[PDB]
């Protein structure tokens, strides 16, 4: 009956361009229980009216988590033209969304640190002539089109990955470039929160 946040507290978290997503329906949550397990640094939210995020019922609660350094904390705002908001992670502009940046504490050992931070600095699709470039901008609450061709971790800074598409899909190529940002001493991650609404069920209320 209680929403299970356990997949976040185990193993290694993914990168920003291949984030892991957890959807919560028909359960009760305790956001203070979660944020107490991480040193919370910076965070932001947008939109209310019901109004809350830890004191309201919704039809669903979406939570994306990924390893992200606080060095590029400014690249997460929607008003930024950085590759993160352009090719990696864009959250919903219409629905009420939140965005939390925290660090994995030293007393939280179940989460093992990845080798380094990784993100997509450019994801574009080239046509049959191999000259026309089409930037594949990421949509809100979607993955990059180049996720199918990029490793779960960028191996070296300045790497290029390309794969020829099938003639049924249109032919051409899909090319993406990777960038690496060296790891910190404590794992820094970013959490993306979005809430939906429906007429049928509202079984996503806070635990009281």
């Amino acid at each position, epitope marked *: 009956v209680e929403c299970d946040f356990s997949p976040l507290l185990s193993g290694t978290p*993914p990168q920003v361009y291949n984030f892991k997503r957890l959807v919560f329906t028909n359960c009760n949550y305790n956001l203070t229980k979660l944020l107490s397990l991480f040193s919370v640094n910076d965070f932001t939210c947008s939109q209310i009216s019901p109004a809350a995020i830890a004191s309201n019922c919704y039809s669903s609660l979406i939570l994306d988590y990924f390893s992200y350094p606080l060095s590029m904390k400014s690249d997460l705002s929607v008003s930024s033209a950085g590759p993160i908001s352009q090719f990696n992670y864009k959250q919903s502009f219409s629905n009420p969304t939140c965005l939390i940046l925290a660090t994995v504490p030293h007393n939280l050992t179940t989460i093992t640190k990845p080798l380094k931070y990784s993100y997509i600095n450019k994801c574009s699709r080239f046509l049959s002539d191999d000259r026309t470039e089409v930037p594949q901008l990421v949509n809100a609450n979607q993955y990059s089109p180049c996720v199918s061709i990029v*490793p779960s971790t960028v191996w070296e800074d300045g*790497d290029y*990955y390309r794969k*020829q598409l*099938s*003639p049924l899909e249109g032919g051409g190529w899909l090319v993406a470039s990777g960038s690496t940002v060296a790891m910190t001493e404590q794992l820094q991650m970013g959490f993306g929160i979005t809430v939906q609404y429906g007429t049928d069920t509202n079984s996503v209320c806070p635990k009281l």
Partner: antibody, heavy 117, light 108 residues
């Protein structure tokens, strides 16, 4: 159009060291990534290690990392595999292949290496 | 490491049947899974990359899917060309583990 061809002795004496060279035709090794994969006769696949002719540093399997090394050649458009202290369990069909994220787009005709005195 | 449990190890089916081959990972691989077809005495042939994306020039009978942490390769209509050994591979983290393989053999 990118092709591959393995070139090996086929028989390696037990105590000594085996060298396996992979020839890539129709593409440059100074881009993308490449790797080696072996398969013992009658069992599954074992991934040796990935490397890069573009970067290019490597990443190997810890089960064979202490006995595996790799050389790279740009002009000859090839790369070799060096496995020392081979045992009777190292009898396998070795494949070299291309990659971009860990999968394998193109494989080469595997070469057999048998170790026995 | 992350290790793969592919099942069934072998199955007997005939032409026209629908056969599903599953593959479970010890940890979450985040859809970074690939399928291969291996004919006897030949190199593995890539069929599916990123769990569900079909390779170029591969028939539409082959499809990829994911439910929970189980990855399934389903051949809608089996045919004579498809009787071989199939493998699943993960490339989420090193070292890259391989499936034991599933041998699809014609049934008498």
């Amino acid at each position: 159009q990118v092709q591959l061809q393995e070139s090996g002795p086929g028989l390696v004496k037990p105590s000594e060291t085996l060298s396996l060279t992979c020839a890539v035709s129709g593409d440059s090794i100074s881009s993308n990534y490449w790797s080696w994969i072996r398969q013992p006769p009658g069992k599954g696949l074992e991934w040796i290690g990935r490397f890069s002719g573009s970067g290019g540093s490597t990443d190997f399997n810890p089960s064979l990392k202490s006995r595996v090394t790799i050389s790279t050649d740009t002009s000859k458009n090839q790369f070799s595999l060096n496995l020392r202290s081979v045992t009777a369990a190292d009898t396998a069909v070795y494949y070299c292949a291309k990659t971009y994220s860990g999968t394998f787009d193109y494989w080469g005709q595997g070469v057999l290496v048998t170790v026995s005195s | 490491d992350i290790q793969m449990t592919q099942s069934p190890s072998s199955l007997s089916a005939s032409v026209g049947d629908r056969v599903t081959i599953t593959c479970r990972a010890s940890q979450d691989i985040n859809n970074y899974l690939s399928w291969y077809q291996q004919k006897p005495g030949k190199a593995p042939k890539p069929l599916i990359y990123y769990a569900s994306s079909l390779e170029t020039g591969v028939p539409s009978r082959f499809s990829g899917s994911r439910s929970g942490t189980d990855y399934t390769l389903t051949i809608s209509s089996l045919q004579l060309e498809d009787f071989a050994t199939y493998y699943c591979q993960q490339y989420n983290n090193s070292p890259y583990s391989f499936g034991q393989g599933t041998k699809v053999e014609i049934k008498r």
